[PDB]
Every structure is written in C-alpha cells, then in structure tokens.
Write a protein that binds this ligand. Structure first.
Ligand SMILES: C[C@@]12CCC[C@H]1[C@@H]1CC=C3C[C@@H](OS(N)(=O)=O)CC[C@]3(C)[C@H]1CC2
Ligand SMILES: [Zn+2]
Length: 257
C-alpha cells in the first residue's frame, strides 16, 4: 500500500506506522558545522573479503542485492559500534533528475543517489529480532554524484533490465561490494531509523563524507526500473527517497576534523 507517490508517499506513512513522527527518525540533514568531531570514535572496520552475494531483487520500492548472512563473512565493526554486524543487503535511493535522490543531505545539499549497506548485530541472532532493538542495525550510507563511471557498479547496472518490475529477481553471485566504496572511511554517525516502513528506530547510521561518482548512463539505468508489477500501468521507479526528518534531541558526531 505505501509508496512514494502523492497519495501513499512519506507524508502518509505515519497513518500505518505512527513511529514516523518518533524521536529518532531518518534520514536527517547533516549540518557539517554543528556536527561534533569526536576523537573517541574508532576507524570503521569494513571486512567484505568473504562476502557472498546471492540474488538481486526488485521489491517495488528499490532494488537490492542480498548476501548470505548465515555466517560472519561480510561484517562491519568498530567506528561507533559495539560488536559485529553482518551485511544482509545493499540497495539505493535515487531521483528523477541528478539534483535529488539522496535521503541524507549535507548542509541541505541533495545528491543524485544514496547507497545503503544494511547490517544487523549478531548478538540478536536474526535481522527480525535486531529490528526490535535500538542498536540492532548499522546502515553504511554512501552518496552518489554524477560524473565519471564507477566500474564496480557496472555488473549491477547491466542486470537491471532482467528485474524491471516488482518481485522480479535474478541470480547475482560473486558481486564484490568493495567496488562501491570511496577512498576515505571518514564518517558522520547518529542514532536513527529505517527510512522505509516499518520505520523502526533500530539503526546506528554511518554516513561517509566522500561520495562516489557514477556516470549519467549508470543512473539512467536505475531510472528505467518500474515501481509497478508486471502488466500494471508503467510508473518509473524514481524519487524513492524519504526527505530529511526532524533531528530533535540528537547529536551528529564526525570521525574527522
Ligand atoms: C524484512 C524487514 C522485517 C525484518 C527485517 C526488516 C528489513 C530490515 C531492513 C530494511 C532496510 C530498509 O531500508 S533503509 N533505507 O532503512 O536501509 C528497508 C526495509 C528493510 C528491508 C526492512 C523491511 C522489513
Ligand atoms: Zn535505504
């Protein structure tokens, strides 16, 4: 029922998911001058060498690449985190045009897209239990700007024609998510939420300062995806981003000066 349209979009979500108006909702605007450098924050540890991608899926709100999370093969640790978080999936948010698409903003700047790598805390055993905990999930967010192509993204772009409509999936083995990361792991962090229903307040957000560049041809392929199923009136999967929510009583911390 929920989506990104006039009648079912973000301004409507609170009716089915009242936590939409909660105290720690995501995304937020990152005010770079107000974020506090925290010299106590550790470097982020990203261990993706043994990642096992399984499937690529059009879920009617995004596309996602799913990983084997039945063992500690692709894990996030350190940074603001206590313990070990397993990579479950990555997905994107993007715009109809390059001047919007990101969920987080930086001094009100919107990027063309935002990559989310979703991880869950192994101490809760499964992602369904982790989403019920305030420290259940860690989402690594990476901004996309349009310029030079990202070679590590092309394997993803080239299969999107095979998952055009909602629920369509394909084999997507041997994909290396290290090819989507920028040089720097400098980050901002704050306590927040899932940015789609059920909007659970279970996420430690880690948003990298350095964007990756993708080409216009790569993001154009995102914009050919459809929100609709098969045989239903064609609606381009574009503008699948929630806007910035109130920061309320939260501090954004920077890992860098
Ligand atoms: C399947 C599930 C119930 C148990 C685990 C839940 C997952 C956990 C994480 C996310 C990531 C979120 O996107 S975002 N933008 O916040 O990273 C979209 C929603 C989704 C897929 C939940 C949907 C409902
Ligand atoms: Zn997301």
């Amino acid at each position: 029922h929920w989506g990104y349209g006039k009648h079912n979009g973000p301004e409507h979500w609170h009716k089915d998911f009242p936590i939409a108006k909660g105290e720690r909702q995501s995304p937020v605007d990152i005010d770079t001058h107000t974020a506090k450098y925290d010299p106590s924050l550790k470097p982020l540890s990203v261990s993706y060498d043994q990642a096992t991608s399984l499937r690529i899926l059009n879920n009617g709100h995004s596309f996602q690449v799913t990983f084997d999370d039945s063992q500690d093969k692709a894990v996030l640790k350190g940074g603001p985190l206590d313990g070990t978080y397993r990579l479950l999936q990555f997905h994107f948010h993007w715009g109809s045009l390059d001047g919007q698409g990101s969920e987080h903003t930086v001094d009100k700047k919107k990027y063309a897209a935002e990559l989310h790598l979703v991880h869950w805390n192994t101490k809760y055993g499964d992602v369904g239990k982790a989403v019920q905990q305030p420290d259940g999930l860690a989402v690594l967010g990476i901004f996309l700007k349009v310029g030079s192509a990202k070679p590590g993204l092309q394997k993803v772009v080239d299969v999107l024609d095979s998952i055009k409509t909602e629920g369509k999936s394909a084999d997507f083995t041997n994909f290396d998510p290290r090819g989507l990361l920028p040089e720097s792991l400098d980050y901002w962090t704050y306590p927040g939420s899932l940015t789609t229903p059920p909007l659970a307040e279970c996420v430690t957000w880690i948003v990298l300062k350095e964007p990756i560049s993708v080409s216009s041809e790569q993001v154009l392929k995102f914009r050919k995806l459809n929100f609709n199923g098969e045989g239903e009136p064609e609606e381009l999967m574009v503008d699948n981003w929630r806007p910035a929510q109130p920061l309320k009583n939260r501090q954004i911390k920077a890992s860098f000066k």
